[PDB]
Amino acid sequence: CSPGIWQLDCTHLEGKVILVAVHVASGYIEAEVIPAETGQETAYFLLKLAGRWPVKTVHTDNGSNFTSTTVKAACWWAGIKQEFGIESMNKELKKIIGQVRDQAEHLKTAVQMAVFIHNKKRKGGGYSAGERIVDIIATDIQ
Amino acid sequence: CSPGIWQLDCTHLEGKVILVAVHVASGYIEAEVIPAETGQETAYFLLKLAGRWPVKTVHTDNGSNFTSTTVKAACWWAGIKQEFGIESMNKELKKIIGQVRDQAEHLKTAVQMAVFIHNKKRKGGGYSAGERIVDIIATDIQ
Numbered sequence: 001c002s003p004g005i006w007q008l009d010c011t012h013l014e015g016k017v018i019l020v021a022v023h024v025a026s027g028y029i030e031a032e033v034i035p036a037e038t039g040q041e042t043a044y045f046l047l048k049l050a051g052r053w054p055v056k057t058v059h060t061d062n063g064s065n066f067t068s069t070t071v072k073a074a075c076w077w078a079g080i081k082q083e084f085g086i087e088s089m090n091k092e093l094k095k096i097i098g099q100v101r102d103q104a105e106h107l108k109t110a111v112q113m114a115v116f117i118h119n120k121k122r123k124g125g126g127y128s129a130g131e132r133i134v135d136i137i138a139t140d141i142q
Numbered sequence: 143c144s145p146g147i148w149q150l151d152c153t154h155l156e157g158k159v160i161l162v163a164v165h166v167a168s169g170y171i172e173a174e175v176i177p178a179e180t181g182q183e184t185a186y187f188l189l190k191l192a193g194r195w196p197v198k199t200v201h202t203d204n205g206s207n208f209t210s211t212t213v214k215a216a217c218w219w220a221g222i223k224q225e226f227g228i229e230s231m232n233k234e235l236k237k238i239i240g241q242v243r244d245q246a247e248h249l250k251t252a253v254q255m256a257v258f259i260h261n262k263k264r265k266g267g268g269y270s271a272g273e274r275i276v277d278i279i280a281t282d283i284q
C-alpha cells in the first residue's frame with residue numbers, strides 16, 4: 001500500500017461533525033471536530049494535513065465531499081489527487097471516544113484523547129500506528 | 143538536541159493569534175490561528191500535537207503560558223513536561239505568510255500555506271524540515 005494515500009471521511013457524534021483522516025498504510029489517524037460538514041472545512045483540513053505529511057492521494061467513502069471548488073483549489077495548491085479507482089476506523093474511534101468521554105467536558109477534547117490513545121497503542125509482540133507512519137515515511141524518503 | 147523537544151509560542155498578525163509549535167531538532171512547524179490567547183486553546187493544541195508526535199518536553203518564550211490548570215491537565219494526561227532549564231521562526235513564518243498572503247482570503251489559510259511552504263522547502267545540497275522530523279523520529283524508534 002502506497003505511503004502517500006490517506007482516507008478522509010466525516011462521522012457524527014452528539015450532533016457534531018468529526019472529520020477523520022487515516023493514513024492507510026499505517027492506521028495512523030488525525031481528526032478534528034468541525035462546525036459544519038462543508039467544502040470549506042474539508043479544504044482547510046486538507047491544507048493542514050498536507051503541510052505535515054507527504055499527501056499524494058486521498059480516498060473517501062463520499063466522493064461528493066470533494067466536488068466544491070474550495071476543496072479542488074486546496075488539492076490543486078497542495079498537489080493532491082483524488083481516487084475512486086475507476087476499519088472502518090469510524091467504529092473503532094467511536095469506541096475509544098466512548099471509553100474516554102467522561103474524562104472531558106467537550107466532545108472535541110475526547111476526540112483528541114481518543115486519537116492520542118489510538119495512535120500510541122501497541123499493536124505489537126509490533127509498533128503503534130504513530131511509530132509505523134513515521135517509519136513508513138522515513139523509509140520512503142530513503 | 144533531543145527528538146521529544148518542542149517550542150511553543152503565540153504571535154500576532156492582523157489582530158489575530160497564531161499558535162506556533164517548532165520541533166526544535168528538525169525545524170518542522172505546526173501552527174493554528176486561535177480565537178483567543180488562552181489556557182484552553184493552548185491545552186487543546188497540546189493534546190492534538192501530542193497525539194501525532196512523541197512530545198516529551200515543551201519550551202516556550204512565555205512561561206506564564208503554561209500556568210493554567212487546563213494546560214497542566216493536558217501535559218499531565220499526555221505525559222509532557224515543561225522546561226526553562228533552571229529562529230525565531232516567528233519572523234521567518236511571518237515572511238512566508240507575507241509572501242502568500244494575497245493567495246488567500248483568510249489569515250488562517252495563508253498561515254497553513256506558509257507552514258506547508260516552510261516544511262517542504264529544501265534546505266539542501268539537504269532535507270526539508272518535514273523529511274528531517276520523520277527521519278529523526280524514526281531513527282529514535284530504532
Ligand SMILES: Cc1ccc(-c2nc(C)c([C@H](OC(C)(C)C)C(=O)O)c(-c3ccc(Cl)cc3)c2C)cc1C
Nearest residue numbers: 103104105106109182183185186211212215216219
Ligand atoms: C476547575 C477546572 C479547570 C479546568 C477544567 C478543564 N476544562 C476543560 C473545558 C477541559 C477540556 O477542554 C479543553 C478545551 C481545555 C481541552 C475539556 O473538554 O474537558 C479540561 C481538560 C480535560 C482533559 C484534558 Cl486531557 C485537558 C484539559 C479541563 C481540565 C475543569 C475544571 C473543573
Ligand SMILES: Cc1ccc(-c2nc(C)c([C@H](OC(C)(C)C)C(=O)O)c(-c3ccc(Cl)cc3)c2C)cc1C
Nearest residue numbers: 040041043044069070073074077245246247248251
Ligand atoms: C468562487 C470562489 C470559490 C471559493 C473560493 C475560496 N474561498 C476561500 C474562503 C478559500 C480559503 O479559505 C478556505 C477556508 C476554504 C481554505 C481562503 O482563505 O481564501 C479558498 C482557498 C484559497 C486557497 C487555497 Cl490553497 C484553497 C482554497 C478559495 C479558493 C473563492 C472564490 C472566489
